[PDB]
Amino acid sequence: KETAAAKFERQHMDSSTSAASSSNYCNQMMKSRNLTKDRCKPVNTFVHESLADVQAVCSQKNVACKNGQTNCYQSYSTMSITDCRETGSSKYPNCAYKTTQANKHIIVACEGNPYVPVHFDASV
């Protein structure tokens, strides 16, 4: 079983690019990160910062998570992100995603020792 920290890395980290360079970014990344294997994951955000910078958020601003838990943290700075969301034309096994690049604060839930991101809650 994949650990929670490793799942967060796979689903939400893309440190190899500064930003989405095209409308096809999401189709490509959702497939390669294995988020379209048995069905199309409806919504998924990738963060274009170093793993260290994203892990550091776990000691930044403590804020409520949408679900009411209190282990969420909001990044002090904005970060480059890409939101990937299925379009109307999307139908497994032909998943199709809209790519929206933005620079926003991220909010992650953190857990464990070491205390690292385990869920992506939202961006602001």
Interface with Cl ion in residues 30-59 (CB under 5 A): 44-45
Contact 110, 117 (CB under 8 A): yes
Catalytic: 119?
Answer: yes
Q: How far apart are alpha carbons 105 and 86 in whole angstroms?
A: 23
Catalytic residue among 8, 9, 11, 12: 12
Q: How far apart are the first and last CA of the chain?
A: 31
Asked if the peptide bond before residue 117 counts as cis, ω within 30 degrees of 0, the response is: no
| Shortest CB 85 distance to a copy of itself, Å | 4
| Candidate list 11, 36, 55, 74; residue touching a copy of itself; CB under 8 A | 74
Binding site listing for substrate: 7, 10, 41-45, 66, 85
Binding site listing: 7, 10, 41-45, 66, 85
